[PDB]
Design an enzyme around this catalytic site. Sequence first.
Site, PDB file in Angstrom:
ATOM      1  N   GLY A 127       0.848  -1.182   0.000  1.00 49.94           N
ATOM      2  CA  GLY A 127       0.000   0.000   0.000  1.00 49.94           C
ATOM      3  C   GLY A 127       0.880   1.227   0.000  1.00 49.94           C
ATOM      4  O   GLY A 127       2.101   1.116  -0.043  1.00 49.94           O
ATOM      5  N   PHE A 174       1.569   2.973   2.506  1.00 51.11           N
ATOM      6  CA  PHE A 174       2.291   3.064   3.789  1.00 51.11           C
ATOM      7  C   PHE A 174       3.150   1.856   4.142  1.00 51.11           C
ATOM      8  O   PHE A 174       3.886   1.879   5.140  1.00 51.11           O
ATOM      9  CB  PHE A 174       1.286   3.299   4.924  1.00 51.11           C
ATOM     10  CG  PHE A 174       0.481   4.548   4.759  1.00 51.11           C
ATOM     11  CD1 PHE A 174      -0.715   4.528   4.062  1.00 51.11           C
ATOM     12  CD2 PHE A 174       0.938   5.749   5.274  1.00 51.11           C
ATOM     13  CE1 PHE A 174      -1.444   5.690   3.888  1.00 51.11           C
ATOM     14  CE2 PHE A 174       0.217   6.911   5.109  1.00 51.11           C
ATOM     15  CZ  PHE A 174      -0.967   6.879   4.410  1.00 51.11           C
ATOM     16  N   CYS A 203      -9.675 -11.429   1.940  1.00 56.33           N
ATOM     17  CA  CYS A 203     -10.369 -11.935   0.783  1.00 56.33           C
ATOM     18  C   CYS A 203      -9.387 -12.890   0.127  1.00 56.33           C
ATOM     19  O   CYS A 203      -8.563 -12.472  -0.661  1.00 56.33           O
ATOM     20  CB  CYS A 203     -10.816 -10.780  -0.128  1.00 56.33           C
ATOM     21  SG  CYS A 203     -11.986  -9.659   0.686  1.00 56.33           S
ATOM     22  N   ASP A 206     -11.994   5.769  -6.674  1.00 56.32           N
ATOM     23  CA  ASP A 206     -10.999   4.854  -7.211  1.00 56.32           C
ATOM     24  C   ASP A 206     -11.605   3.504  -7.510  1.00 56.32           C
ATOM     25  O   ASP A 206     -11.042   2.457  -7.155  1.00 56.32           O
ATOM     26  CB  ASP A 206      -9.826   4.734  -6.249  1.00 56.32           C
ATOM     27  CG  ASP A 206      -8.532   4.290  -6.939  1.00 56.32           C
ATOM     28  OD1 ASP A 206      -8.493   4.117  -8.187  1.00 56.32           O
ATOM     29  OD2 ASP A 206      -7.554   4.092  -6.201  1.00 56.32           O
ATOM     30  N   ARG A 263      -8.709  -3.533 -10.078  1.00 56.44           N
ATOM     31  CA  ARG A 263      -7.580  -3.730  -9.168  1.00 56.44           C
ATOM     32  C   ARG A 263      -7.926  -3.513  -7.698  1.00 56.44           C
ATOM     33  O   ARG A 263      -7.262  -4.059  -6.812  1.00 56.44           O
ATOM     34  CB  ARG A 263      -6.396  -2.804  -9.525  1.00 56.44           C
ATOM     35  CG  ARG A 263      -6.606  -1.323  -9.218  1.00 56.44           C
ATOM     36  CD  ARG A 263      -5.399  -0.474  -9.615  1.00 56.44           C
ATOM     37  NE  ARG A 263      -5.669   0.960  -9.445  1.00 56.44           N
ATOM     38  CZ  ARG A 263      -6.309   1.742 -10.322  1.00 56.44           C
ATOM     39  NH1 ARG A 263      -6.761   1.266 -11.483  1.00 56.44           N
ATOM     40  NH2 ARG A 263      -6.499   3.022 -10.033  1.00 56.44           N
ATOM     41  N   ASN A 264      -8.951  -2.704  -7.444  1.00 51.57           N
ATOM     42  CA  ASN A 264      -9.350  -2.351  -6.083  1.00 51.57           C
ATOM     43  C   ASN A 264     -10.507  -3.182  -5.607  1.00 51.57           C
ATOM     44  O   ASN A 264     -10.970  -3.014  -4.475  1.00 51.57           O
ATOM     45  CB  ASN A 264      -9.733  -0.862  -6.017  1.00 51.57           C
ATOM     46  CG  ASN A 264      -8.525   0.037  -6.052  1.00 51.57           C
ATOM     47  OD1 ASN A 264      -7.473  -0.300  -5.529  1.00 51.57           O
ATOM     48  ND2 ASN A 264      -8.674   1.192  -6.675  1.00 51.57           N
ATOM     49  N   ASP A 284      -9.777  -0.807  -0.603  1.00 49.31           N
ATOM     50  CA  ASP A 284      -8.909   0.331  -0.911  1.00 49.31           C
ATOM     51  C   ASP A 284      -9.663   1.664  -0.930  1.00 49.31           C
ATOM     52  O   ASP A 284     -10.028   2.188  -1.988  1.00 49.31           O
ATOM     53  CB  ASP A 284      -8.126   0.093  -2.226  1.00 49.31           C
ATOM     54  CG  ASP A 284      -7.037  -0.995  -2.083  1.00 49.31           C
ATOM     55  OD1 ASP A 284      -6.430  -1.111  -0.993  1.00 49.31           O
ATOM     56  OD2 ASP A 284      -6.784  -1.736  -3.061  1.00 49.31           O
TER      57      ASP A 284
END
Length: 260
Positions: A19, A21, A90, A134, A138-139, A152
């Site tokens: 991510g 962070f 998931c 977003d 992909r999210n 996300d």
Amino acid sequence: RDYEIQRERIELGRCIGEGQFGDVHQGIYMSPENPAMAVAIKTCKNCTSDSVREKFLQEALTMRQFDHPHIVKLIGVITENPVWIIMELCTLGELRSFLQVRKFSLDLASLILYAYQLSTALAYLESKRFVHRDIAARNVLVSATDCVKLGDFGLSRYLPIKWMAPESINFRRFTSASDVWMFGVCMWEILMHGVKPFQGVKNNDVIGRIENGERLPMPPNCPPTLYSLMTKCWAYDPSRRPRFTELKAQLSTILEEEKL
């Protein structure tokens, strides 16, 4: 409802992703008498910093407010200094990979179901006046072969040019309606089995093409009614887009039609 978790309940597994962070791990959250619960663990590279901690724990704060079967759930948080956010896992991973790999094992009905499930999550957020900003394959995460979930929420309400609505690209306007545009691009992605929109096209040329009325073409095997819904999601005028409530009801019907 206390979200603070004892670190000794958490067993860290391998790194699963990354991510803003830091690394995301899979792992186990253990409880007395209970079965071991699989979990995702968000890590924070510089959580000693108050600045870096805040934006990191903000995603958890945001997840805290939502409760929906197709939105990834906050399990808890560890604020002791290796700071960790504990999320529901998931196990089948990112949707795009899933669709690319499991192509010849999936049917058109499974693809519409994912779109429906996601519309369900997006209506729910729409009712809370939350803008995701977003929405993209992909999210989206795969909880089971018959169950996807939206994750996300680094970007929030209360840059992905190729997914964005014209008024988001032109004027930084982000609304449910601009989410609707993105959802429409996400649906195309699902039906294309995780091909990206506008491949071989530069980000800066995307707006030009959209302004010239161009739209992603109809995926092979996509039913005309569905593509019709997608083009409605890509109305230039945000006021002519269907709302997620409308989309959910239309997707229900289209899914039933395809199952039959």
